[PDB]
Amino acid sequence: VPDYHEDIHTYLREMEVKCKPKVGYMKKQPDITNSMRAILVDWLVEVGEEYKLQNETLHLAVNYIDRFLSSMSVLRGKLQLVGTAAMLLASKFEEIYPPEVAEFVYITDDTYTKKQVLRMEHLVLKVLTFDLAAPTVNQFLTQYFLHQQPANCKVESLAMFLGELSLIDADPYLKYLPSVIAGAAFHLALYTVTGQSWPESLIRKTGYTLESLKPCLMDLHQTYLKAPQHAQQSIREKYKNSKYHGVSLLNPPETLNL
Amino acid sequence: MENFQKVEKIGEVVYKARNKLTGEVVALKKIRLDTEGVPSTAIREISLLKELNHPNIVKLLDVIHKLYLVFEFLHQDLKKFMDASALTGIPLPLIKSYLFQLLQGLAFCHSHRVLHRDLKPQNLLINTEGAIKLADFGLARAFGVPVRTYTHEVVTLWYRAPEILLGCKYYSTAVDIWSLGCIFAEMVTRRALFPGDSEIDQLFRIFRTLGTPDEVVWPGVTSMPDYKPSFPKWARQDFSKVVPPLDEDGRSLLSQMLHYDPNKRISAKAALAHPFFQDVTKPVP
Ligand SMILES: NCCSc1nc(NCc2ccc(-n3cccn3)cc2)c2[nH]nc(C3CCC3)c2n1
């Protein structure tokens, strides 16, 4: 293993605590709700598919939105402008070929002007004090995938699917750190596809036992069981593609036997 | 901006300036914002330098909305120091100090999941007290474990690693080590190791010095997208001819920094432990 893998993991574990949004922020937002956030995140999943953006870009955009809404009151009519600026910034940070501003305007169907998107970009940068290099569920998942005995494309696709569903529902997923969500998503995907469990090598790397992951796992199991009923369906549609081994079509396990 | 007196243009725009209230001498990096808003290069440089607090990385002091990045000022870059030392040469202990410090800076970048991707002498800043610092993080990227495909058009040609020239799907930390190997040789011999004038000339300059790589030296090389079985097969030159002034330890380290196979090329952290650095000191230029 490269001699900086452990250093990066230790650093990302420090930064995920510093980049965490305020867990109870939505109760202090006078005009927006968890449901309007779910609608915005589901919409960004679709924007990502339309522009063939990385999963990481979507995860970063959600981190930026939750951090912005942690300190700034936003009316429902402007929530999509925050999301659009977040996705533009996430794209500039993470993408080889970020979509142009005129494309972000087009994808809002001219709800906002170019000037509005560029002014919101400045404001998001100011509120986040240019701290864009946030750890994501995705960054922990790709590290955890190196511990597979052996590597299984369905396990990887299903763990990504599960980590993505967590983005939609601020209740309960804002209670958990990205490293913990990734741990639950990886265990649940492994167990579903192969009947294997959270491996000893990841217990040593992370210090997480299956027991420490249990609260998050129980939440993520319910999310998985109820996904076909959720009002938001863009992530299920995405993970039906052959790109993702159609993993969203698999049956969730009935019990986890924890 | 009213608190800064521009002294002069030092790069291109970077100005030497003075804080009118505190007297602090700074470098102002002006980024023009004119139709896509804040450039990705500025967003990456600011966000990544905020996590890269190290004695061998240039300090970002402030950001002001135009967009001005306020940095610490250093008196000279390694390119101008090299030009000034072309007749004398850089003393061996100072070459060793500078490489040791560049590797400390780069090891810190890699340990914080940052690729520099433009290490060349003009981006390496020196002060009057014998420090050298990595600068210009406009081409840098936060990388993932493991990497995915990143921008292909990276590193100034003379300092560009063979896995980029041959179009590997994946590159990572090893590309920075390649650039520093080139810079090490350049400090020793007083000229660019691989001064290519095109991608093909750059590759052939590498092949003529280190030997045309084969499946034993670099497993997978003959399958790489821009590899051609018609490439001439040159033999490897003896490092006694490539870097004549360099001792056995120097030659061992340079050869490990220029390994063809990125998976075998020495890491910044392992380079710091090499016996070449056993007697390292911090002379003043
Ligand atoms: N590529 C080198 C030019 S860009 C540069 N140079 C610096 N210092 C070297 C220098 C000083 C004065 C002169 N000079 C005087 C009269 C005319 N030229 C030229 C070179 C810097 N110190 N700190 C920086 C921050 C990192 C981003 C800005 C910075 N940049």
Whether B133 has a binding-site annotation, put simply, is no
Whether B77 has a binding-site annotation, put simply, is yes
> Is there a single domain that holds both residue B16 and residue B111?
no
Q: Which of B165, B280, B278, B275 is nearest to B227 (CA)?
A: B165
Domain count, chain B: 2
The structure was resolved experimentally with X-ray
DSSP structure string for chain B: -TTEEEEEEEE--EEEEEETTT--EEEEEEE-----SS-HHHHHHHHHHTT---TTBPPEEEEE--EEEEEE--SEEHHHHHHHTTTT---HHHHHHHHHHHHHHHHHHHHTTEE-----GGGEEE-TTS-EEE---TT-EE--SS-----SS-S-GGG--HHHHTT-S---THHHHHHHHHHHHHHHHSS-S---SSHHHHHHHHHHHH----TTTSTTGGGSTT--TTS--PPPPPHHHHSTT--HHHHHHHHHHT-SSTTTSPPHHHHHTSGGGTT------
Which sign does the torsion angle of CA A210, A216, A217, A218 carry?
A: positive
DSSP structure string for A54-73: -HHHHHHHHHHHHHHHTT--
Residue B27 Cα, ligand 1 centroid: separation in angstroms?
7
> Is there a single domain that holds both residue B22 and residue B147?
no
Which of B15, B18, B45, B77 has most ligand 1 atoms within 8 Å of its beta carbon, as the pocket-test mutant?
B77
Give the position, in ligand 1's atom list, of the atom nearest the Cα of B58.
26
Whether B29 has a binding-site annotation, put simply, is yes
> Is there a single domain that holds both residue B167 and residue B31?
no
Q: Is B235 exposed, middle or buried (0-12, 13-18, 19+ CB in 10 A)?
A: exposed
Q: Which of B40, B63, B142 sits opposite A130 (nearest CB)?
A: B63
> Is there a single domain that holds both residue B30 and residue B84?
no
Residue B37: its chain A contacts at CB < 8 A?
88, 101, 117-118, 121-122
The phi and psi torsions of A110 (rounded to 5 degrees) equal 55, 30
Domain of residue B142, CATH code:
1.10.510.10
In a domain, B283, yes or no: no
Work out how many CB contacts closer than 8 A connect A with B: 84
Domain boundaries, chain A: 7-20+134-258, 21-133
In a domain, B187, yes or no: yes
In a domain, B2, yes or no: no
> Is there a single domain that holds both residue B48 and residue B94?
no
Of the three residues B72, B92, B120, the one that is the final residue of a domain is B72
- Chain A residue with CA closest to B142: the answer is A133
> Is there a single domain that holds both residue B119 and residue B144?
yes
CB contact under 8 Å between A121 and B38, yes or no, is yes
Q: What token pair was written down for A116?
A: 């509005």
CB contact under 8 Å between A133 and B47, yes or no, is yes
Residue B8 Cα, ligand 1 centroid: separation in angstroms?
10
Q: Which residues sit opposite B29 in a β-bridge?
A: B14, B69
> Is there a single domain that holds both residue B122 and residue B57?
no
> Is there a single domain that holds both residue B66 and residue B121?
no
> Is there a single domain that holds both residue B48 and residue B26?
yes
In a domain, B216, yes or no: yes
Q: Which domain holds residue B202?
A: 76-278
In a domain, B3, yes or no: no
> Is there a single domain that holds both residue B178 and residue B199?
yes
> Is there a single domain that holds both residue B59 and residue B150?
no
Segments in chain A forming alpha helices (H): 5-18, 34-50, 55-69, 76-94, 101-107, 114-127, 137-145, 153-168, 170-173, 178-194, 200-206, 210-226, 234-238
> Is there a single domain that holds both residue B27 and residue B81?
no
Q: Is the CB of B58 under 6 A from ligand 1?
A: yes
Q: Is the CB of B77 under 6 A from ligand 1?
A: yes
Give the contacts of B159 (CB within 8 A, at least 6 positions apart).
B118, B119, B120, B178, B179, B182, B183
